[PDB]
Amino acid sequence: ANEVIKCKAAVAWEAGKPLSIEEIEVAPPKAHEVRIKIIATAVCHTDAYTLSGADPEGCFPVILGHEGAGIVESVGEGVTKLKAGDTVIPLYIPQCGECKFCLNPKTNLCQKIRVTQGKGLMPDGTSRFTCKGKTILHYMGTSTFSEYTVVADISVAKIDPLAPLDKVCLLGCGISTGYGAAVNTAKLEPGSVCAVFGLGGVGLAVIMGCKVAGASRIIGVDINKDKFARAKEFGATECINPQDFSKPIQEVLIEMTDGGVDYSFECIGNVKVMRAALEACHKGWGVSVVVGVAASGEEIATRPFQLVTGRTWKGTAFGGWKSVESVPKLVSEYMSKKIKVDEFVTHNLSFDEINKAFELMHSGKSIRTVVKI
Amino acid sequence: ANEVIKCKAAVAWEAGKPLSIEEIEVAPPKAHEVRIKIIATAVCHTDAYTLSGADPEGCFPVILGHEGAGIVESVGEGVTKLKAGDTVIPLYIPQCGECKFCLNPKTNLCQKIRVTQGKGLMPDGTSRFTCKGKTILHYMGTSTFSEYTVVADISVAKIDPLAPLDKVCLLGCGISTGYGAAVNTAKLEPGSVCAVFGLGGVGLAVIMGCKVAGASRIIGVDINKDKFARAKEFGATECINPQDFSKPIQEVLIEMTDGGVDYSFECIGNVKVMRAALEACHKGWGVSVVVGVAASGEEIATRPFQLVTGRTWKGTAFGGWKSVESVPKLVSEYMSKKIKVDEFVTHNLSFDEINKAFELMHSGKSIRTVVKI
Ligand SMILES: Nc1ncnc2c1ncn2[C@@H]1O[C@H](COP(=O)(O)OP(=O)(O)OC[C@H]2O[C@@H](O)[C@H](O)[C@@H]2O)[C@@H](O)[C@H]1O
Ligand SMILES: Nc1ncnc2c1ncn2[C@@H]1O[C@H](COP(=O)(O)OP(=O)(O)OC[C@H]2O[C@@H](O)[C@H](O)[C@@H]2O)[C@@H](O)[C@H]1O
Ligand SMILES: [K+]
Ligand SMILES: [K+]
Ligand SMILES: [Zn+2]
Ligand SMILES: [Zn+2]
Ligand SMILES: [Zn+2]
Ligand SMILES: [Zn+2]
């Protein structure tokens, strides 16, 4: 039978402190739950933002991490589509396939377990993690910063058994989000002129998507010129630094493109840049997609004239991919060389030095750091 | 040859004052211009906005009016598609069919004569109107508040010769804008759940379009309950007054539709209602279209979370209709009973009583007042 597992995990006891490598207990999977052995995980801005304690609904203690890949260790009662040994990727955006959202082709925002997940609990209202006599909360329904995690059975994508887990764990968030922003949300046409604000993993993934879509011109924008080289390798036709111009960035872009871009993507989470991205779009048909997540309370603004004269403001979550059915296909596209994943890995670390992954992010010297469990 | 015409026109000598019926002179049409005998014209909120003096672009003296219908009196050199006697509708949104906007299927914002039109001048940089020795400016390239006006040849739609001009003049702006917002900008699908903010002529046209598109639910919203009766006649399934609730209107709509509407349309020009219209949209796939024109300087705002979680913000100008080719089609749809026009006329006045149309508009007692020249 499925026994409690004693393993290692990176616990965040409180905000503003480095993660603590602890020995924890992981309970067996209950009905419709899946226990996964995490093989590799990466760190994302979102993990750091929750860890900083600036996130309103961020609670502690908690096991963070939402970019991972592993193998099913055991399944709970009623689970038949998955079994021990299956190669998988945990999903923070699930796909029950039955709610009004899953049934609507225009969205991927399954709401089946959103409430419990937001509270760091499994669908039944409890947590499977414990450490030193204390209950530890789940995070984004994945909690990949542990040798073993338990997730709702609708939060699992079964992928190619041959996929390199130390690479595809990145499809758990960043790459998929940016790529999907281009092909699912924007659905840009061949020849499109694009502008991408923010050249981190998300922005690079957007560029990658724009290239797959056949974009003619792809202008990368970042205040950190060190990000330009890789952006060009991904397909950016040119890059510009807002700091190099006295005029607002939207004015610069409008001048460069004789009117503005056909599509702009904000991959930073800065409301001021979001406005610039919208205003940088061409009159009549320009479309701007918000991909970055802004701090709570902050709002975007512009003059309605911008919309009346043809521009559209959109946003995306996990690139609009219906998770369970898309992630496996994304893995296959990587396996077949249609999209890149390896090029996103700039650093590799062992589980014990996971905190170094956070240092690297604050330093601005990394795209994605893969942590080997 | 074509001589100078001495006729009457409603001149706006200065901001904040009523219009004055004056004896003016209308010069003959120059190359690529068309002189039109106006038979009927209506008054629109935009005309009042400019007359008030609040319009940063408003210049005086000027002959306002952009909702009209008439007969071609004469044409200038180089004009062959039009001739004396043709039944027409002046267009504030022209269609040269050659600029980058006209060539793009995604917009109707022809820019060929925008500069001169914004200055109240014909394409050659001069005005065809004079009164008591003074130059009188054109307005929105149409100046329909005159027995005779001169417009650019690309600002003319030739229509069905049997069309009643005292009715189709309304297709010059209001009806076309609202109808188009639904079928062109929103492109709502059959069964869609919609909300229309503002039940004036524009909102009624939106409702009309939603019904043609096969919406399952059309919720009209207006603080003036006297507008509900006609809204229901146009197809509204129910009407609500924001004043009858203590919660923000978006919360009311969300609760009424189990999540929000599929499509919302703001037909008021109120930035606060614009935000509410967006937020009243369903998570994941809701789309809000701004149709009303907000006062200069004001801006719309919301939390980017609204977009990231699936909502889309759009806007429209003259319903997205490429003017020259669309208006004749709209007249034909009216003649065949596909769309309504007569139902928008609530009042009729003589030219000398034109100022009463403005009074009726501000009193909130009318939808559209048709002025017989
Ligand atoms: N004002 C700015 N203008 C242009 N670029 C900027 C600006 N401010 C920051 N940037 C650049 O934005 C980039 C952000 O990339 P990352 O921090 O590495 O984050 P990433 O993983 O790519 O995701 C970014 C955003 O998208 C969301 O999906 C994610 O949660 C975060 O909100 C960095 O290169 C940063 O220099
Ligand atoms: N806060 C509000 N909430 C709901 N309805 C409102 C509100 N404020 C005003 N209204 C209603 O909005 C309606 C506006 O209709 P009209 O004044 O008759 O204007 P209309 O011709 O329909 O055009 C409206 C708008 O569209 C624009 O493009 C046009 O220039 C104007 O900005 C009126 O019925 C008014 O009662
Ligand atoms: K598109
Ligand atoms: K649509
Ligand atoms: Zn679902
Ligand atoms: Zn993430
Ligand atoms: Zn044109
Ligand atoms: Zn108008």
Triad A331, A333, A338: Cα angle to 5°: 140
Active site residue B44: yes
Strand A20-26 and strand A5-11: the pairing is antiparallel
Cα–Cα distance, B108 to B102 (Å, whole number):
6
Cα–Cα distance, A287 to B314 (Å, whole number):
9
| Residue of B104, B313, B314, B323 to mutate, testing the A interface (most A Cβ within 10 Å of its Cβ) | B313
How far is C-alpha A265 from the chain's CA centre?
15
Kindly state the helix (H) or strand (E) to which residue A33 belongs, with its residue range. strand A33-42
Strand A20-26 and strand A129-131: the pairing is antiparallel
Strand B33-42 and strand B67-75: the pairing is antiparallel
By Cβ distance, the residue of A109, A305, A313 closest to B283 is A109
- On whether the CB atoms of residues A142 and A93 are closer than 8 A, the answer is no
Indicate the SS3 state at residue A322: coil
DSSP state of A170: G
Query: Chain B contacts of A303, Cβ < 8 Å?
Result: 294, 297-300
Retrieve residue B350's tokens.
């003589």
- On whether the CB atoms of residues A361 and A45 are closer than 8 A, the answer is yes
CA of A177 to the centre of ligand 6 (A): 8
Kindly state the helix (H) or strand (E) to which residue A308 belongs, with its residue range. helix A305-308
In sequence order, which ranges of A140-246 are alpha helices (DSSP H)?
A: 165-168, 174-180, 201-212, 228-234
How far is C-alpha A223 from the chain's CA centre?
22
Closest to B328 measured CA to CA, from B82, B100, B136: B82
**B131 annotated as ligand-binding:** no
Strand A287-290 and strand B368-372: the pairing is unpaired
Closest to B69 measured CA to CA, from B154, B157, B131: B157
Measuring CA to CA, how many Å separate B195 from each of A244, B192, B338? Answer: 45, 10, 22
Enumerate the CATH 3.90.180.10 domain ranges in chain B, comma separated. Answer: 1-177+317-373
DSSP state of A181: I
Task: Name the resolution in angstroms.
Answer: 1.9
Active site residue A281: no
Residue owning the nearest CA to atom 4 of ligand 2: B222
Does A281 touch chain B if contact means CB atoms closer than 8 Å?
no
Cα–Cα distance, A230 to A345 (Å, whole number):
12
Contact B107 A310 (CB under 8 A): yes
Cα–Cα distance, A222 to A241 (Å, whole number):
5
Cα–Cα distance, B11 to B127 (Å, whole number):
14
Cα–Cα distance, B126 to B120 (Å, whole number):
8
Closest to A269 measured CA to CA, from A4, A54, A3: A54
Closest to B65 measured CA to CA, from B54, B87, B52, B50: B50
Retrieve residue A106's tokens.
């225009």
Retrieve residue A99's tokens.
């709610």
What Rg value do the Cα atoms of chain B yield, rounded? 21
SS3 content of chain A, % helix, strand, coil (to 5): 30, 25, 45
Kindly state the helix (H) or strand (E) to which residue A115 belongs, with its residue range. helix A114-118
Does A44 touch chain B if contact means CB atoms closer than 8 Å?
no
Cα–Cα distance, A93 to B95 (Å, whole number):
46
How far is C-alpha B294 from the chain's CA centre?
14
CATH 3.10.20.340 for domain A178-316, yes or no, is: no
3-state SS of chain B is CCCCEEEEEEEECCCCCCCEEEEEEECCCCCCEEEEEEEEEECCHHHHHHHHCCCCCCCCCECCCCEEEEEEEEECCCCCCCCCCCEEEECCCCCCCCCHHHHCCCCCCCCCCHHHHHCCCCCCCCCCEEECCEEEECCCCCCCCECEEEEEHHHEEECCCCCCHHHHHHHHCHHHHHHHHHHHHHCCCCCCEEEEECCCHHHHHHHHHHHHCCCCEEEEECCCHHHHHHHHHHCCCEEECHHHCCCCHHHHHHHHCCCCECEEEECCCCHHHHHHHHHCECCCCCEEEECCCCCCCCCEEECCHHHHCCCEEEECCHHHCCHHHHHHHHHHHHHCCCCCCHHHEEEEEEHHHHHHHHHHHHHCCCCEEEEEC
Cα–Cα distance, A372 to B246 (Å, whole number):
55
Indicate the SS3 state at residue A320: helix
A169: left (phi over 0), alpha (psi -120 to 50) or beta: alpha
Measuring CA to CA, how many Å separate A372 from each of A143, A155, A160, B87? Answer: 15, 22, 20, 77
Measuring CA to CA, how many Å separate A270 from each of A18, A182, A276, A301, A319? Answer: 25, 19, 10, 12, 18
Cα–Cα distance, A196 to A180 (Å, whole number):
14
DSSP state of A12: B
Cα–Cα distance, A240 to A219 (Å, whole number):
7
Q: Which residues of A4-43 are buried (b: 16+ CB within 10 A; e: fewer)?
A: ebebbbbbbeeeeeebeebebbbbbbbebbbbbbbbbbbb
Measuring CA to CA, how many Å separate B199 from each of B131, B220, B222, B240? Answer: 38, 7, 6, 11
Active site residue A194: no
Sequence-distant (6+) residues with CB within 8 A of B114 are: none
CA of B81 to the centre of ligand 5 (A): 57
Measuring CA to CA, how many Å separate A24 from each of A289, A352, B63, B249? Answer: 41, 15, 80, 48
Cβ–Cβ contacts within 10 Å for residue A217, how many? 17
Q: Based on the number of CB atoms within 10 Å of its own CB, is A277 exposed (0-12), middle (13-18) or buried (19 or more)? A: buried
Does A298 touch chain B if contact means CB atoms closer than 8 Å?
yes
Closest to B94 measured CA to CA, from B81, B74, B109: B109
Tell which atom from ligand 2 comes closest to the C-alpha of B293: 32
Cβ–Cβ contacts within 10 Å for residue A324, how many? 24
Owner of token pair 């002046």? B90
DSSP state of A311: -
Cα–Cα distance, A265 to A314 (Å, whole number):
9
DSSP state of A242: G
Ligand 2 pocket mutation pick from B46, B197, B244, B268 by most atoms within 8 angstroms of CB: B268
Retrieve residue A290's tokens.
């918000």
Closest to A137 measured CA to CA, from A59, A49, A55, A76: A59
Contact B294 A303 (CB under 8 A): yes
B113: left (phi over 0), alpha (psi -120 to 50) or beta: alpha
Q: Which amino acid is at A167?
A: K
Cα–Cα distance, B274 to B288 (Å, whole number):
8
Enumerate the CATH 3.40.50.720 domain ranges in chain A, comma separated. Answer: 178-316
| Residue of B188, B279, B305 to mutate, testing the A interface (most A Cβ within 10 Å of its Cβ) | B305
Retrieve residue A123's tokens.
């669908």
Q: Which CATH architecture best describes the domain A1-177+317-373?
A: Alpha-Beta Complex (3.90)
